[PDB]
Structure formats: structure tokens, C-alpha cells
Design a protein around this nucleic acid. Sequence first.
RNA 1: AACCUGGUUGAUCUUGCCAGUAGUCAUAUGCUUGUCUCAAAGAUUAAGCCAUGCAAGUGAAAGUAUAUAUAUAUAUAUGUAGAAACUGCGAACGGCUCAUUAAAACAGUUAUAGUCUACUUGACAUUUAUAAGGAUAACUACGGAAAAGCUGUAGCUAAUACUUGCAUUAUCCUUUUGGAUAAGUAUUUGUUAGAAGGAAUUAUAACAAAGAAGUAACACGUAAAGUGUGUAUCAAUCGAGUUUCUGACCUAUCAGCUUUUGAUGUUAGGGUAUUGGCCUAACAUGGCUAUGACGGGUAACGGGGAAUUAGAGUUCGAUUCCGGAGAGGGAGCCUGAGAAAUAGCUACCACAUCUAAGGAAGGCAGCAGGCGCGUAAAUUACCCAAUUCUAAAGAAGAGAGG
RNA 2: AUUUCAAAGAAUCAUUCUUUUUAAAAUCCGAUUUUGUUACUUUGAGUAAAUUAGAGUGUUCAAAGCAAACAGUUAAAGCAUUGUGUUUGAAUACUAUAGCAUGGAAUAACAAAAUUGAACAAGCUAAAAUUUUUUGUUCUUAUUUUGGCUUAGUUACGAUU
RNA 3: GGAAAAACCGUAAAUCCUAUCUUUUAAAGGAAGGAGAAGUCGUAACAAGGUUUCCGUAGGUGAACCUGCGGAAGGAUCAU
RNA 4: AAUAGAAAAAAGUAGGUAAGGGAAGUCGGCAAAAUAGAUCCGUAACUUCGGGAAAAGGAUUGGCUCUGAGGACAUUAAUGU
Lengths: 171, 257, 146
Amino acid sequence: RDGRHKLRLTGGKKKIHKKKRKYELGRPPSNTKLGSRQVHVVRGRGRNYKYRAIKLDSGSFSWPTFGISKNTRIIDVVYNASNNELVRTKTLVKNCIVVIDSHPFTTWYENTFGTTIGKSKNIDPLLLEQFKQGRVLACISSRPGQCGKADGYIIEGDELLFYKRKMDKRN
Amino acid sequence: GKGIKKHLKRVNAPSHWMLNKMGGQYAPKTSSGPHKLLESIPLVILLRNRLKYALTFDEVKMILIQKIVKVDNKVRTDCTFPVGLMDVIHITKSNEYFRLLYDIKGRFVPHRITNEESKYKLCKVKKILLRKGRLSIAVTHDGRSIPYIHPDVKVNDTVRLDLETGKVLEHLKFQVGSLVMVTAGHSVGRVGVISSIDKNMGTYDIIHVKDSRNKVFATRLSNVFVIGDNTKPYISLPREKGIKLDIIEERRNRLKA
Amino acid sequence: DVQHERAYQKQEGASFFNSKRYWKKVGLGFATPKEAKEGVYVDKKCPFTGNVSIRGRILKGMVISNKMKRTIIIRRNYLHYVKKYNRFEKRHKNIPCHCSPCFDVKEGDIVTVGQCRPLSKTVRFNVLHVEKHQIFGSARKQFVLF
RNA sequence: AACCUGGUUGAUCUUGCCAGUAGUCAUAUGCUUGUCUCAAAGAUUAAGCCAUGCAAGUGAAAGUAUAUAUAUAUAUAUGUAGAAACUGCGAACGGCUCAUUAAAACAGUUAUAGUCUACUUGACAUUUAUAAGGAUAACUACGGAAAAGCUGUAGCUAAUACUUGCAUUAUCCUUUUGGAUAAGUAUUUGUUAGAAGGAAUUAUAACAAAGAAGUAACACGUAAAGUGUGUAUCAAUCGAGUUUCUGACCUAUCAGCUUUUGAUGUUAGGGUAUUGGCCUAACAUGGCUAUGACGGGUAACGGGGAAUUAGAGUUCGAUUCCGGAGAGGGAGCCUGAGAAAUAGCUACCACAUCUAAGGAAGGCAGCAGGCGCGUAAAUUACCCAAUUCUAAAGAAGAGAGG
RNA sequence: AUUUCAAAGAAUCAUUCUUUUUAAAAUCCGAUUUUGUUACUUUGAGUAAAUUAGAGUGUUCAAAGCAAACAGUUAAAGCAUUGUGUUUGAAUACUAUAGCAUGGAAUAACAAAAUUGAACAAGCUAAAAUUUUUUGUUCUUAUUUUGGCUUAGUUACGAUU
RNA sequence: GGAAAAACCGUAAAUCCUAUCUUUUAAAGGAAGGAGAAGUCGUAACAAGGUUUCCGUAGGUGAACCUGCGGAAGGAUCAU
RNA sequence: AAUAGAAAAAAGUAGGUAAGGGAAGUCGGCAAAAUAGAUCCGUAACUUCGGGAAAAGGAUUGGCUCUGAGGACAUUAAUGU
């Protein structure tokens, strides 16, 4: 649990008195999964309410190229840059790489240009590959265990290339 | 547990309470809000220990249940309400108005104010904040919010403030020639015209202060309350006007009654 | 330059759809080094390009160890007054400091560190200025006016 | 008040001790005590044990009364009280002890741009309506248990308990007019723009998405138009958590410690009220050490201070204030803004009470008083008049306090 | 050991304290005002009361305490134009040995340190800015100015015993 | 919507087996130190104390001690 | 293998197995049983300092589905086989 009882700056074993106080925590990990949404409200100090996501499914995913976000179903959890546990169990955190359906974005692009606000340098080939299979890699941008949501951004360009390579062929 | 310590003991009280060693074991602890506890006096001390209009705290309670007493020209419902660094007590039945100031001895005195100056007070801003909709708000020493405050007013400026409508009348810009009153320094409870205002990056700020007797002394910028212009004090300062007397002068005067 | 870590290099507040790096004033008469202004470097514990607050006390010390990843140990040397004999004695104290990718600090360099935001268990301070200095005596034994 | 005598010898000067001598808000004790003022008083020894009693409750303009009482006008109308009970709020303080603790706790000094904040104070809100939805206590009855602050049915019925839910402002065109267009406070994400601060990834402004919660279905009453209670966000305030620097008694017959069990760093997350190895994974191989680390001792809570002080000092600091620690031993929760509470709860161990022999309940280091320990320490007194505290805050409570 | 000695005046009691001025560099209207760091020291700021020193104050004195005092047989007086007591007092300082600001000419430390360094004038050159310049989301070229870099000269040029 | 009951991590009291350290405390016998009485035995030291003293050291010895080796005078010689 | 068959008790011999206690057994724990492999921890008195030592005393160990570590070649640091 929280606070005092860890080793001294000298490396010494510090003797402890002053018993554990209420303001000293150690509280359970989030373990939000892939499945029809479930969240439990948690009561923090001062009656500050937090949301502990146990299942998730549709987050709000942001299309970097036009800087816009829409609420969208997540197809799967696919890669984790840390441990092997999270990705195998399909349990998702703000590090995690998920896959989203591209239809909101595909629709928006159709609305703007007329085939698949205002002009930019438009779609990238890596983004185009993800859109083409209908199923798009995205990075979660919010903390499900604190906020109840796993809202995200479609993973882009150099970050996409690096992780795509890192994810792979060997697999 | 280890929560909010409610009571206040006798010599736990600030110095200028003057609640002596005899005659009690406790002091009153102020209600929250208008000014800081350490920068306040309650009504009990003023009515009983200063004015001497009550024998006991119970006689103060008897005064307070009756609705003739007003602070900020508004009725207040408890003895432990704080009268701050500066504010106005109005006693309806006697028709008396007092404004609270620090004395040269470093303790709070209620100084008699008349009807004409009673309708306003002069209020130092502690903060000026920008709130949503591009809307300014000032925050005063006496705990008032002023929305729509004039944008060239700044965070150490004082402001003349109506007490019925709550509107600001004028403002007094903090400068090197400003008449200043010391809140709580070693120079506590005294007034001067400022020799220099001295600003230094990421640290406490100094002001050099020049006396009516044309002597010089230092004071911290944080505890200095702007009070007039080199023309005049804007409010009515006490009858002895913040003047320094030496120890030798005071005893020589003391004998020379 | 080359990548070699398993984390994407965000450098937060950079921005990417506005037309064409991040660093701040740092204040107190101090300023960003040339390697901060023009360098490619990414960190989050760097004072120049991180979100770490350059708050609190600013002291000078002497670097004694330089071999942790972007992290330095500085000794603050002093004379402690003994009232009984009305005399002084030599005393010293070790302060763990973040080093920045800006500064390639070496043994016996003087460093000006700040209090900042506590980073972790031991490490709590950060270098703001490297004043280059040379002493050929071994660092553990060295006394300086810092 | 900056101060000394007697004692080595047959006699002597010297070294050197012993002895006297004075003080001690420092304890015990012997003898003696006509007064008066003043008044420390079960720390040292067992943070050992406790018989009996008592120590926190709260209703006078302002939630709820067909128990009932009552004043006018006449078994009806008004009304006014009201035992009682739901409800609300407090009991997180104050009192007690100093066992544990030796860079922790404590003291000054930062920082919190890493945060939370009830009462109190001031700002002040955004995507069926002449009044909605039931359900529950007291209460009525039958009951059950040796005991206990045990409680079971069924019919009820309220609430400011619980649950629903009823424009307007700004931008563009037009004359202080008429049309058109927009409209979520916290909180979170992605995209930019960028009043203040030494420093901003801050105030703030816009865009695209999500998004709590909400904005009174409540009570009094100002000429011989006023108020209370409730409410989101913001600030203030009463505070609180963390966090910087600097400061320790004795001990080396304690010299190398720390690191698979996070030690030290980096990265990523989770967790938290927030920073943080706080916790998990992955990756580094560090970090601390004669200035005495790491152990061990202390009849060691820390400070303001107390005793003696010519000047240094030396000894001492349970013991009226401030801060910490603890509530039989350990441990864990709940409730709530605030407690890891302790006259809150749960469990284990150490104790232990009533038992109807099934079972059930208990915690004085609160105030008395008792036992045991001892060299050593007072009354189960009376009172809230003052001092203050808590409430629905005058009018009542309080072994706090006197 | 070593690095800026001094001089003259004025005030004042043979004395004492003080002021003026005596190289160089930068800046402002030929005159005007700035110039290592730290220790040390001075002032300060901000700083719990109790205690403590200590003032005021005859508790019956003193230990104490934080009070009191004055006149009136109920008015003289003050101030309101029959109304209304008054003067007051409850100081000052110690309050780490550290941190913060702050004046400092001595004393200490430290700092750069010719097996070569830096002060200027000259010429070439790439960076940024100025001036130029048509067409109501936005577009060519050009002179010039400022800082950075390469190269011949020129300073009282550059090392204590 | 929802009580009991179970299961899983995560806290984690307590019990028991050791392991190490702390503290007193037992124990036959061994081997010490001091105090007391004119006890037994020598005659060791003090004077050249009747073999100069003392040091270091080793060996002997019932001892006090003796002897060797090399020092010093704190020698009974500071003198051809 | 210097024999077969049938029956199946004693007894023998080579084996097993046994409640509750656990050396009370006897010349002596003889016999028998318990221990036991690896990997990870931890390891004393004492010592000729080499040892003691595998001391003592603990823990773990199947099956499956994953993750990481450890090569070889050739295209200018990355990409291939």
C-alpha cells in the first residue's frame, strides 16, 4: 500500500510508527475488457467521483488529418508497447493500440471531397492502407480506470510506421 | 482522529486580543470568510474588551440576538463574525459608525466614522482574475468579488467601493508617491508616503517607506495597504495619524500629561 | 537522428497541422542553451522542453557522478558552525539532480540546479546551468565553495 | 556578588584526590506547624488491571404532528401549542497518557505551476404546472427471547427523507425597432490561437467530439415592497495533505552497506485527492558509506523552555502553550467534506462479564474511586454564574470549564 | 612576500569626525552615472504567546496582577442647537547558530593563467533584418543594414618575486 | 432491480516449525581478585640491605625468586 | 535349462501389506522403513583456513497456449534469404 515503510535513502531499514491514515491509499487496478460497456463509480476523497471501466466497446476517436473526432466502435485490441499480458487478455489502457471501423471518417471524407473543414494535404498512404481494409489502427488517448472511457486517435505516420514494424513477419 | 481543531486557547490567541492570563482559559475562534483569522478581530473583543459595552460574552450574545448591530451596513447573526483588517460596524440605536484600523501600538481600534464617509469604504484588491466570457473579477482583502472591474486597475491597487450598491467609485493606482498603511510588518500599524517600490524576480518584494517625521524605514510589499495619495489619506486615519514616537519621547510625554 | 527506444517521442505541445519545436523562457535571468533551441532531443524531465515546473530554490553544486541516464549527483560543500568551540568544521551533502540531454556534464563541473517538481524516490532536483570547471583531484575528496 | 577551608609528613613545598560548603517550579522522607496570601499534586514503578456511577448532544419567525393539549368564534370553524417519532446537523473536537520513534518525529525555512477542502463569506447557471411519482417509520394489533441498546408480521401515513419534472441571451440583415443564425458548468480527448506570472502546456478564445451534475413541486414575513433553508460553478476563508533547505544523545569490542522480496536510475502504464517505485511490467547497474553510512544502545516524544549560570558552559525539559505519536495487542474496513475515528464498527490473538448451559454481550492512558505496583501522589463533592465549545445555535446542553 | 599610495578642504575639541579630488573603460546631455564572485561583516525584512529582560501602574506593600486615574454631595467643564461623564492603559526588546533581502574600500578564499592569447582597422563570404515592387486564397526580381565566419597590417600589445 | 451462498486476485491478523540476535539466570569442578586476625614459612626489597638496581626477554624454581642474553641509571662511578 | 500335471491347508522360503502408538525391542534400531534427481534459496559449531558442505533447513518440479534470450548467409544504417 501507499507511503512509509520503503527503504531509507542510505539503504537503511527505517523503523515505522504513525499507523496508516485514511489519506494513504493503494487501490485496485483497472482491468477494462472488450465487450458491452460496464463501468463502476468509485468514491474518492472529498466525494470526488471516478469511473472504473470494466468493459468497453465504443470510444471517441479522432482523425488527425482534419482534427475532428467521432464516437466509434472498436473492433479489437491488437498491440501493447509494454507487457504481453494486456494485449493477450484484450484489456485496454491509454498505452494500447486498438482497431476501429473507418466508416465515420470514410463518410466525413465523402462529405468533404465527394469520393473516397476545408483543404489540406489530404490522406496519407499508411492511413489509406488502414482505411482500405475497413479496419483502422488507433491509439487510446484517455484513462478508462479514471474517466470511464478509452477515447483515442487514429495512429498516424511515423508513429504508425514504427509500431507497425515493431508489431511484425517475425510474427 | 486528525481533523479540524475547533477551539482556541487563551495564549494560543494572537497578541492584540488582550485576553489576559486571568479571567478565562479560552478565546473565541472566528467564523470563516471576510478576512483571515490572524488578520481579524471578532465582535466579542470589540464590544466587551475594547468598547466595554458588555460585561460578559453572554452580554455580547444578548447584544447579538438583538438586530440593531450591522457590519458592512448589513445585520450579522453571530458573535464570532470577523471584523477583519478594516470594515464598518453600525449600531442603529445609538446611531454610531466605527471603522476598524490597526493602531501604532499594533492592536485593533474602532475609529469613529460619520454617515457621509460610511456609505463607502476603501478596499485593497488581493487578486484580479479573468473569468469566462472575457470578464474581469477583482478579489478584495475583505472578501468581495467585483465583476466588470476596470482593466487598467492592477493587483496591488486599492479601490473606493460603495456598500449598498456594491459599485466601484474610483481607484488609486499603486506608485512610488502613494500614501501607504502597513498591515503587519515590524513597522505594523503606521503610514508613510513611499520612498521606493522595489521589484525582484521570483521572490518577496520590498518597499522603502518615508515617514511624516521624514525618517526612512523598510517594509514588505505584500503587507502594505494603499491608503491615499501624497495629497491626502483617502479615508479617515486615526487621530494620531500613524506617527512614530520614540521610547524616550513616549515616557517623557507619559510623565508630561 | 536515430531511434532506439520502445516509446514514441511525443515532445508534447509541438503541434502538427499548423504551418512550419517546443521550449520556454525559464526566467530568473536564465535562458535556453543553443542545444535546447536548435536540438532534436526529446524528454519529459528536461526543464526546457518538458512540463516540469522550474519552481523553488536555486543552488550551485559540484558533480560527483555523471554515469546515470540523463541524471547527475551533485555535492553541496559547506562549513558547519560549532557554537561550543566557536569554530567551524567541514561538512557536505549530496543532491540528486536530473541532467538534461542538453548538457554533457563532466566530473568536477560546477552546476546550478533548481528545486523544481520531485521526479521520483531519490531524484528531486534539476540542472539549469552548467558552469564548466576542472579539478584533477578525485571527486569524492574535493571541496569547493559550492 | 567573577570568592574557599581540613586531611600525604617528624616538619616542608608541590602533584593529586577525598571531605566539608551553597543552590536545584527535583523527588522522596524525619520531626515540628499560631497565622495569612499564593497553589504543584498516581510521570519515573506496570501504555498493568478495573467494581459502581457519571463524561455529546441538539427544536422560542422559519422541514415533518387527526397521540394529545389549548385561546378566541360557536359536539363545527379558525388557530396556537405539543409528549412522541422520522428527518437534519454535531459527536474528526476536547480530555487523557508519552509506550513506540535517532535524520523519520520535531523546529525554523521553502515549494505545492502536483492537490482536496463541510460550516462561514462574496460572486452567481448551461442541451400536469394554481404543482407530479410511491414507500417507510413512529402509530394500531398479534407475537417471539433466561438475558441484551434483540426484534418478526400486517394494515397504515408524512416530510426541505426518497424519485420525477414545468424560455432566453449573443452573433448577421434592417434605424433606442423588426427578421435570420447559433447556445452543456465541471470533467475528458484531439486540433489551434495565446490577460497574468521570474518561469505556463496557465487565465482566456475558437474548432470537432464525448460528458457528470444542475439551475427551488421547500418555510417564515417589511408603510401603523423583507427574510430563512436549499442549490451548480468560481473565488475567498477555516484548514489539510504532500514537498525544499538547515539542525541530534551515546556507541567502531558496529566498516563496509543497499540490490532475486524496488535497492538506484530510465521508459510505459495503473493506482492516487494529486506528485511520487505509491504499485505492475520492460529495460538499464546503479545508489549510499570516517563529515562515522549500515547496525547496536538510550531509564530518548520534539520545541518554545527549566536549573545553575561572571563570561564560556554544564545538567534538565512526563509535567499549563504549539506540534507529533497512541487508545489491550496487531490488523482491517464503513460512514462522512473531514476519521484508517475508537464512550464508530469487524476479525484474530491477550484478557474477561452474564448465561436458562441454547446463547449473548464487554474494554478508565475521559472524570471520580478501587486493586496491583511501589520511595512516591487527593473527593464516586457542588455547579454551569464566568471562560469557551456543539446544535434545529438566546432562552439548551458540556466531570470541557469553574 | 606580491598588486591603488594619497592629497586638500570643511565641521568640531592643539584633537576629533566628515567631504571634496586622483588613472581607465562603457553611457547619457565638452559636462553628466556605472564596472569580478564567495566567505566575513553591516543593516534589514518577515518572525507564536506563556516564559524572559523590561517600561507604565501603591495588589494593604511584596510575591503579584493588567489595571486604573480625574472631578462632581451629582456642576464647574467639554460638545448638540433642555440632550450629554471624561482621561485613559494594557509598552519596548531578546524571539536559531540557518534561509531571504541589504551597505561594505579591510581581511580571507576563488576566478581566468603565453610550450602561446585577444584588442582593433582592412578585404571576401553564407544567416537574419531594412528599403524596393505590379494584380481584390496569393505570386517571381533588386539595392541596402545588422550580427556570424575565412584571411595581411596595427596596440605602451600580452607571463611578479 | 435484487438477499444469502460460492470462486478469484489483492490486503492480511494470528498459529506453528525453524534460523539468528538480546537479556538475565542455573550448574559440579576449575581458576581469580580484594577484606579480616601480631596464623605457618622463609628473609625477598629498603643502606653497597650484606650477589648494584631496574627494563625488555626466555628458561628454571614451592616461593619471596634465581640464572642467561642485550639495554638504561631512575648507580654505590657524571674524575688521569 | 535333470521332469510334467492336478490340487491347494499347514509349514517353509522369496515377497507384499497393515489401525492406534512409536524402540517401551534386543547384544546393538539388527532387519525393514524414512531420506533420495534437478533447479532456486539458505547453510553452523569448528578448522592445519584447504575444508566443514550436497552441512543443517527450506521451496519448486505435469500437460497445454504464449513471450523473451542465444546463429548463419547478401543487398548500403536499414532491408532481405
